[PDB]
Amino acid sequence: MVPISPIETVPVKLKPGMDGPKVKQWPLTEEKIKALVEICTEMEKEGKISKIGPENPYNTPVFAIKKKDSTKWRKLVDFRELNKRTQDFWEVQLGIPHPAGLPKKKSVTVLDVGDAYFSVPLDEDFRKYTAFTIPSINNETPGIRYQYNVLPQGWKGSPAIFQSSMTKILEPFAAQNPDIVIYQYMDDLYVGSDLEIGQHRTKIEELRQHLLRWGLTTPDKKHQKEPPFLWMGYELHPDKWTVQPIVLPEKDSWTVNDIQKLVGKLNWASQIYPGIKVRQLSKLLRGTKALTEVIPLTEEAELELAENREILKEPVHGVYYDPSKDLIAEIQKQGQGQWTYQIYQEPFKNLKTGKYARMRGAHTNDVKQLTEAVQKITTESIVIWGKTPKFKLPIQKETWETWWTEYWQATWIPEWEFVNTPPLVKLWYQLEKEPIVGAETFYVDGAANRETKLGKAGYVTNKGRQKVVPLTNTTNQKTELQAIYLALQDSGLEVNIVTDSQYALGIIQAQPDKSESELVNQIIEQLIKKEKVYLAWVPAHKGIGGNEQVDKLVSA
Amino acid sequence: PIETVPVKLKPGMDGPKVKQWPLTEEKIKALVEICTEMEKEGKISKIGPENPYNTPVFAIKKKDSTKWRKLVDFRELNKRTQDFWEVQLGIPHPAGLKKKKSVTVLDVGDAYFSVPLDEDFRKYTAFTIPSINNETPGIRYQYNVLPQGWKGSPAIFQSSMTKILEPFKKQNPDIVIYQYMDDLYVGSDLEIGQHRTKIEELRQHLLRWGFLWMGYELHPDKWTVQPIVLPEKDSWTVNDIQKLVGKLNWASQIYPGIKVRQLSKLLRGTKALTEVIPLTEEAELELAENREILKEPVHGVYYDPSKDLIAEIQKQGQGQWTYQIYQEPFKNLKTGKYARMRGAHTNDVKQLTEAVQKITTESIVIWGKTPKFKLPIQKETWETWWTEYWQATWIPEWEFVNTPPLVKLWYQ
Ligand SMILES: Cc1cc(/C=C/C#N)cc(C)c1Oc1nc(NC2CCN(Cc3ccc(S(N)(=O)=O)cc3)CC2)nc2ccsc12
Numbered sequence: 001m002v003p004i005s006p007i008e009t010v011p012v013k014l015k016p017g018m019d020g021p022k023v024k025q026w027p028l029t030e031e032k033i034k035a036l037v038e039i040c041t042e043m044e045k046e047g048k049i050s051k052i053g054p055e056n057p058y059n060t061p062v063f064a065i066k067k068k069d070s071t072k073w074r075k076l077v078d079f080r081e082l083n084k085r086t087q088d089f090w091e092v093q094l095g096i097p098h099p100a101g102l103p104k105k106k107s108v109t110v111l112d113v114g115d116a117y118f119s120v121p122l123d124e125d126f127r128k129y130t131a132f133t134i135p136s137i138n139n140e141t142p143g144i145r146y147q148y149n150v151l152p153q154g155w156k157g158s159p160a161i162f163q164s165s166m167t168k169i170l171e172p173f174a175a176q177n178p179d180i181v182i183y184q185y186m187d188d189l190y191v192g193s194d195l196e197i198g199q200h201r202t203k204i205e206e207l208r209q210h211l212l213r214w215g216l217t218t219p220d221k222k223h224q225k226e227p228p229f230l231w232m233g234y235e236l237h238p239d240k241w242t243v244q245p246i247v248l249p250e251k252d253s254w255t256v257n258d259i260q261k262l263v264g265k266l267n268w269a270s271q272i273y274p275g276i277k278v279r280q281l282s283k284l285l286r287g288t289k290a291l292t293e294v295i296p297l298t299e300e301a302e303l304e305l306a307e308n309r310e311i312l313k314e315p316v317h318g319v320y321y322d323p324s325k326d327l328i329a330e331i332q333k334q335g336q337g338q339w340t341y342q343i344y345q346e347p348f349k350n351l352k353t354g355k356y357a358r359m360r361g362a363h364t365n366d367v368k369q370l371t372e373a374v375q376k377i378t379t380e381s382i383v384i385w386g387k388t389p390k391f392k393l394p395i396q397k398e399t400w401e402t403w404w405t406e407y408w409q410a411t412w413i414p415e416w417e418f419v420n421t422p423p424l425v426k427l428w429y430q431l432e433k434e435p436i437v438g439a440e441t442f443y444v445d446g447a448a449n450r451e452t453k454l455g456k457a458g459y460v461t462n463k464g465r466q467k468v469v470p471l472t473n474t475t476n477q478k479t480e481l482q483a484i485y486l487a488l489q490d491s492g493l494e495v496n497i498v499t500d501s502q503y504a505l506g507i508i509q510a511q512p513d514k515s516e517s518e519l520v521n522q523i524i525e526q527l528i529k530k531e532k533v534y535l536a537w538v539p540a541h542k543g544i545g546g547n548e549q550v551d552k553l554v555s556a
Numbered sequence: 557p558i559e560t561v562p563v564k565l566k567p568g569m570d571g572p573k574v575k576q577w578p579l580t581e582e583k584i585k586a587l588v589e590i591c592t593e594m595e596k597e598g599k600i601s602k603i604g605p606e607n608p609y610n611t612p613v614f615a616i617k618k619k620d621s622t623k624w625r626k627l628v629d630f631r632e633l634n635k636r637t638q639d640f641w642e643v644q645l646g647i648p649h650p651a652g653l654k655k656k657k658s659v660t661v662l663d664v665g666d667a668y669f670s671v672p673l674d675e676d677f678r679k680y681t682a683f684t685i686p687s688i689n690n691e692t693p694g695i696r697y698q699y700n701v702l703p704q705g706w707k708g709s710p711a712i713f714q715s716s717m718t719k720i721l722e723p724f725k726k727q728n729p730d731i732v733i734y735q736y737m738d739d740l741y742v743g744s745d746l747e748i749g750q751h752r753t754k755i756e757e758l759r760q761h762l763l764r765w766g767f768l769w770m771g772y773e774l775h776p777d778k779w780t781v782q783p784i785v786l787p788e789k790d791s792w793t794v795n796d797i798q799k800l801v802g803k804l805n806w807a808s809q810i811y812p813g814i815k816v817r818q819l820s821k822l823l824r825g826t827k828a829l830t831e832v833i834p835l836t837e838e839a840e841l842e843l844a845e846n847r848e849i850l851k852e853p854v855h856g857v858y859y860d861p862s863k864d865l866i867a868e869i870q871k872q873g874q875g876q877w878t879y880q881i882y883q884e885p886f887k888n889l890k891t892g893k894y895a896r897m898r899g900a901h902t903n904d905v906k907q908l909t910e911a912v913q914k915i916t917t918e919s920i921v922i923w924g925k926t927p928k929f930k931l932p933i934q935k936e937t938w939e940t941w942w943t944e945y946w947q948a949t950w951i952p953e954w955e956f957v958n959t960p961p962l963v964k965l966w967y968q
Pocket residue numbers: 097102103104105106107108109181182183185190191192227229230231236237238239320691692
């Protein structure tokens with residue numbers, strides 16, 4: 001016998017103060033008992049489980065189940081209770097690579113490490129917690145009691161402990177063979193290389209020879225899958241990648257569930273299919289828990305679905321990543337607060353695509369949304385490629401400079417260049433820094449009655465112009481904005497406006513170009529029409545003339 | 557030092573489980589080299605899947621240094637670590653450090669690595685060097701020695717530190733030494749030429765007791781509450797007077813007896829904003845009385861060590877940033893202003909990040925703790941970029957201001 005190294009054991013504990021499981025074994029049918037006895041006898045001979053005495057007080061129920069044509073029984077040990085009481089682990093397989101970050105590999109083999117899983121021992125002091133009982137025939141003898149010596153399938157810690165043990169075993173082989181990559185997923189190990197295929201198979205069984213040190217049999221994966229690889233919803237071809245085929249169903253009647261499973265395919269497809277849009281079909285999703293609700297499509301919802309399928313008409317693929325080339329990201333504004341982007345290294349060969357939807361706010365502007373998109377793509381690219389891409393943005397360099405030098409917040413976007421792809425992000429108005437000589441000065445104010453919702457809005461100017469408009473179903477904040485709107489409506493191209501509304505000044509100083517409020521939107525449309533607007537704030541009720549005068553006019 | 561000091565978290569609190577944020581390839585590679593050497597020196601060890609805790613890590617370049625350095629975001633673990641009555645009932649914060657002519661800060665962080673960490677607490681210092689694109693599992697480590705950035709490290713080391721320093725302290729009764737986390741603050745009242753000697757004299761004294769050649773030079777004789785000042789003009793437009801009345805109305809929340817009505821009466825009527833208004837003598841008097849009021853300190857302003865310090869920052873344009881440190885509104889404990897941030901005339905976030913670090917340094921020197929920042933920036937922009945310009949071994953807390961404060965004008 002050739003000595004084999006032991007796979008080092010991971011110590012395992014229960015959750016603090018918690019005890020092991022004590023669940024009653026179900027009664028089974030004589031044919032199920034007979035099947036479980038045979039199954040457990042073979043695993044016992046392979047070392048997987050061991051028989052124990054009656055001192056062990058813990059138990060976990062066993063089951064026997066069948067399949068349709070597979071006319072054999074298979075053991076199921078239900079570790080739900082033990083899992084609730086087992087310590088948390090470092091689950092180190094949550095993230096999975098994105099294909100656009102992978103470099104191409106000339107050759108790839110797959111080894112099955114299924115048999116390897118059972119040579120990983122379970123912590124000795126923990127095995128007592130995995131005990132299970134095979135009930136006896138007619139309940140006339142003591143049930144046969146076993147416990148596990150290896151990581152049980154279905155137990156909380158088995159995936160993390162197994163992958164950790166393989167990784168430690170593989171670490172020196174990977175480090176001393178830097179010309180190959182090794183990736184684990186399931187009971188399968190993927191080995192890629194760029195050397196000629198002869199040197200590849202030698203490195204491969206060099207790895208099997210290495211795995212023999214701990215006595216792990218690893219043949220090739222049965223029925224070797226020719227490319228493409230069907231893995232985590234992708235199709236990995238030797239030189240290109242795409243998602244698995246996206247086919248959008250045809251339906252006369254779309255329900256909540258038929259709607260939310262389409263956006264899933266659309267969201268998944270948006271990583272390679274450029275220009276996918278989701279807002280209008282998404283919108284019908286805003287608030288409903290009954291997933292069978294048949295809600296009709298708006299014809300903006302039909303327009304964008306149709307706009308979709310035209311993009312989904314032909315398959316498109318991404319290229320794999322070349323670290324020697326630059327990484328570039330281009331963004332397009334699409335309207336209604338949504339954006340698409342392409343990341344590529346050479347023109348017309350995208351690594352991947354994507355989209356960004358605006359954050360839910362009461363007011364916003366295109367520059368802030370573009371900035372948010374840039375940060376999201378930045379973070380995604382560091383995840384996928386470990387670097388920030390060079391950006392191509394549909395905003396003029398002069399527009400960005402004006403924006404960040406004057407915006408009240410600190411803001412920044414990394415190295416980028418203008419791309420003249422309409423529509424262009426622009427600033428739509430700019431308030432003056434100083435009062436405008438020769439321009440009419442409008443003192444505005446509004447007020448409303450909290451009980452009757454009756455209000456007034458108006459202005460008085462230095463040239464004696466005046467207006468007061470009575471309003472119904474209004475609030476103080478609404479009349480303050482309406483007062484500013486009237487002044488914009490009734491002034492020439494240049495105007496000084498004096499308000500005491502901290503609420504109105506906070507909105508306008510945020511520089512929105514679109515709003516949930518039609519009143520704010522109407523004010524924005526007025527601001528765009530002007531050539532110069534100076535907006536001044538004074539404190540209310542201090543006897544500031546003009547403001548004192550209009551305050552009395554609008555306050556009842 | 558063989559013996560472990562026993563440490564544990566607060567009652568009913570698990571260890572930290574903070575997600576590692578993505579890192580660039582060059583920062584990952586820097587961390588791999590740093591941690592490989594730390595592993596060979598025994599300061600850290602590989603951990604297994606039985607440790608589910610995590611604390612974020614990234615890589616830093618300190619002031620005027622080309623060597624990559626690793627920084628651990630121990631903020632969560634510090635919150636959860638037992639409140640340290642650090643070998644004592646506590647040290648009273650040296651109120652004299654903030655009054656000495658010059659203060660030099662020394663990175664004495666390496667001194668921690670020579671004392672071992674309690675074997676049962678090491679699990680809670682777990683961190684992950686991330687992989688790119690999840691292409692391999694992260695590299696998982698835990699500390700065996702006192703790590704830099706941890707609350708317990710200065711506390712546990714205080715006995716040895718006070719011993720190392722006593723010969724130098726016995727010589728110099730006028731040098732005030734203060735320790736905050738990984739940093740020593742050395743403040744004297746003599747001029748620069750002998751000051752660089754006595755820090756090199758203390759520097760050279762340290763190496764004999766078991767470094768980094770580095771330092772930073774401060775001058776806390778400056779740190780006041782900047783007064784509110786009003787314009788002095790020979791001709792006032794309507795707009796000038798409206799702004800003055802606004803500023804005085806704001807100041808009246810801070811100061812008693814500020815009056816506006818004589819200045820308000822200058823604006824009788826509905827006048828053009830650009831029209832010149834002559835000041836009455838009653839308004840000049842009222843403006844003069846307001847000027848006198850604004851030169852006194854504010855009444856009833858005191859530091860309460862039971863409350864958090866709050867720091868607000870306003871972007872003023874052209875590389876200028878104003879800031880106020882307080883514990884309750886309008887009771888400013890300290891105000892200030894920064895200009896032309898070095899090497900960042902084009903990057904708002906770099907400037908803001910340097911301002912945060914300067915303000916935190918001033919707050920350590922004055923009160924011995926860091927303030928809670930209110931940052932004029934969207935969360936997603938700050939979160940993406942601040943680690944790129946961070947150079948201090950501590951990290952404060954922050955929140956985000958999304959509504960433009962009206963009072964940025966008044967600190968202009
Ligand atoms: C090696 C590997 C395989 C898979 C498959 C799972 C399934 N199911 C997944 C990952 C994450 C892998 O991990 C890495 N994969 C790559 N590149 C890839 C390798 C595969 N090719 C496709 C391909 C190439 C050649 C042939 S061929 N001509 O041999 O038949 C067939 C298919 C696309 C890029 N790079 C790295 C770097 C570090 S890890 C890692």
